[PDB]
């Protein structure tokens with residue numbers, strides 16, 4: 001391990017970060033979490049968390065990676081050897097996230113392959129998967145039995161084929177399994193070979209999604225009924241703020257969308273030069289991420305308002321209110337533009353491009369963090385390609401559980417418990433507490449001043465010292481005191497063993513800190529206080 005290879009230029013670092021932390025979490029997860037919580041009231045805790053913990057923790061991870069010049073699992077050895085379980089917890093969280101983050105891309109691939117016909121299959125109600133209820137959206141207001149929309153019927157009876165419950169796995173769907181295999185093969189081939197920053201390819205891969213988003217926003221804003229959707233999206237409801245669910249959802253959506261507590265930002269920052277101003281760039285990238293999410297919300301809620309006006313029902317009873325809101329709302333939008341197939345193909349290509357870069361960055365970060373533990377064995381003595389192939393195969397086999405007829409429930413369980421929620425709060429709280437109260441805020445500020453050239457303000461120091469731990473602990477305690485079980489589409493109730501499995505998924509990463517603390521204490525010689533003093537001393541964080 002001579003030295004980590006630095007970036008060729010700052011543009012490479014900026015492009016890598018932008019492609020890694022802007023993606024499906026901005027256009028797929030934000031809208032449905034906002035819709036589930038009623039909209040409007042979701043934006044107050046969202047912005048509170050964004051300006052209290054979101055940017056400061058992201059900058060802290062980047063600056064720690066740059067300072068220590070080490071990955072996301074070994075940097076904590078040079079800051080606080082006792083609290084070295086944070087890296088292991090992050091690697092567990094990223095391993096669990098990589099398994100279920102790709103089923104969305106499998107669904108997108110299915111939709112893209114299905115959009116190559118003369119007429120879109122989700123536009124009408126005369127097919128083998130339709131039910132006697134299916135009625136055209138144009139005729140819903142004209143007449144009147146619980147009618148169903150062709151888009152929802154398609155999504156629920158052709159792509160998913162939903163089962164009565166999680167205890168009814170049904171049979172494996174081979175068409176979705178083939179799409180999952182295809183996307184996993186593409187991901188594996190784009191990592192073993194190592195996709196380079198081709199000037200033309202990236203120039204297009206990083207500009208097409210924003211153009212498509214602008215086109216969708218312009219189309220949505222001119223539909224009849226967009227004003228009601230915008231008012232539903234913007235105006236808040238103070239009564240909803242008395243529940244911990246909205247607070248925890250909005251708080252952890254920021255953590256999910258900024259890719260923190262994952263070990264990926266530390267790895268990305270480890271390739272920076274020592275004398276590099278990585279503060280302004282981080283602020284601008286956070287601005288870009290938040291703006292992208294906020295802009296996409298306008299378009300999706302305008303489409304929802306138009307659909308609600310057309311069908312003649314409320315805006316809260318038009319879509320899934322779960323991980324299918326985008327797949328219900330955006331195809332309905334593209335069915336109204338001229339040449340619907342062209343725009344459908346373009347939209348799904350944009351979705352795939354947004355997802356694939358994030359998946360690439362996360363898997364690369366996980367691999368490079370797990371390799372640094374044994375840099376001798378897994379570099380020459382054993383093949384790195386074989387290790388990558390084994391990881392991909394195991395992840396695909398594990399993700400096969402969400403492809404069966406009853407896999408939506410497993411996907412929802414994974415989304416709620418793994419790589420989101422209490423585990424993210426736990427990791428963020430421990431990172432901030434360690435840095436602020438064991439290493440030293442001013443001690444880190446000296447290194448930041450040495451690296452970037454100027455001393456920052458007290459905002460980051462205060463956020464690390466007080467604001468973030470208080471928010472995390474308060475949200476955790478508020479959620480625990482008033483407990484409400486998880487549901488799917490506000491109607492399905494999970495069995496007890498499913499909740500136990502979800503809590504085990506959450507605890508698999510949360511249990512890594514005390515175990516590592518105990519093992520480190522047991523591996524040291526001498527009196528207890530001497531051992532504690534020896535393991536709280538930073539082992540020369542390279543300055």
Ligand SMILES: CC(C)CCC[C@@H](C)[C@H]1CC[C@H]2[C@@H]3CC=C4C[C@@H](OC(=O)CCC(=O)O)CC[C@]4(C)[C@H]3CC[C@]12C
Nearest residue numbers: 055277279280283284286287288289290291452453454
């Ligand atoms: C809607 C949301 C997402 C917007 C929130 C982001 C803001 C908090 C950003 C916008 C631009 C950022 C600023 C852009 C420029 C600078 C100047 C920079 O100082 C220098 O570049 C000095 C250069 C030198 O001396 O070499 C310090 C960071 C700062 C204040 C950034 C701090 C945070 C700011 C205000």
Ligand SMILES: CC(C)CCC[C@@H](C)[C@H]1CC[C@H]2[C@@H]3CC=C4C[C@@H](O)CC[C@]4(C)[C@H]3CC[C@]12C
Nearest residue numbers: 169170171172394395396397398399400401404
């Ligand atoms: C970590 C890995 C090794 C765990 C094992 C993954 C594989 C071997 C497991 C996980 C879930 C399993 C599937 C779950 C449900 C069904 C439906 C049944 O009608 C055919 C078998 C099938 C398709 C199982 C086959 C094997 C399976 C895919």
Ligand SMILES: CC(C)CCC[C@@H](C)[C@H]1CC[C@H]2[C@@H]3CC=C4C[C@@H](O)CC[C@]4(C)[C@H]3CC[C@]12C
Nearest residue numbers: 047050051052279283454455456457458459460
């Ligand atoms: C010396 C340089 C680096 C100092 C940089 C100061 C910047 C990074 C800090 C200092 C004070 C901070 C602001 C303090 C108060 C608010 C009000 C809140 O509603 C939005 C966030 C906002 C606007 C903060 C955002 C960023 C901020 C302007």
Ligand SMILES: CC(C)CCC[C@@H](C)[C@H]1CC[C@H]2[C@@H]3CC=C4C[C@@H](O)CC[C@]4(C)[C@H]3CC[C@]12C
Nearest residue numbers: 084088092507508509511512515516517519520
């Ligand atoms: C130098 C020392 C600290 C390295 C020793 C590694 C130990 C402390 C770490 C490395 C990764 C960690 C494991 C990662 C994954 C799991 C699976 C989970 O189901 C139980 C906890 C468990 C088993 C963790 C326990 C502690 C663990 C084994």
Ligand SMILES: CCCCCCCCCCCCCCCC
Nearest residue numbers: 043044047048051052457458459
């Ligand atoms: C409804 C939106 C509310 C947004 C509230 C954001 C609160 C952020 C507090 C940050 C305080 C930083 C002080 C820095 C002073 C130098």
Ligand SMILES: CCCCCCCCCCCCCCCC
Nearest residue numbers: 088091092093095096373508509
């Ligand atoms: C819940 C399972 C998630 C996936 C498993 C992640 C574990 C990663 C490896 C842990 C460290 C192994 C080496 C220990 C000796 C240094």
Ligand SMILES: CCCCCCCCCCCCCCCC
Nearest residue numbers: 166167168169398401406410501
């Ligand atoms: C017919 C009885 C139930 C059969 C199993 C249904 C649930 C299967 C998914 C949950 C187990 C795997 C989760 C991931 C574990 C790492």
Ligand SMILES: CCCCCCCCCCCCCCCC
Nearest residue numbers: 095096099370377391394395398
């Ligand atoms: C759901 C987890 C999938 C990925 C599994 C990652 C762990 C792979 C095996 C452990 C590698 C590190 C130890 C190697 C010892 C020679």
Ligand SMILES: CCCCCCCCCCCCCCCC
Nearest residue numbers: 465466469470473474475477478
């Ligand atoms: C909202 C219902 C009660 C929850 C409030 C819990 C107290 C929050 C502050 C606790 C102190 C933070 C611990 C570490 C900060 C230095």
Ligand SMILES: [Cl-]
Nearest residue numbers: 026030257293
């Ligand atoms: Cl977001």
Ligand code: NA
Nearest residue numbers: 019022023358
């Ligand atoms: Na991306």
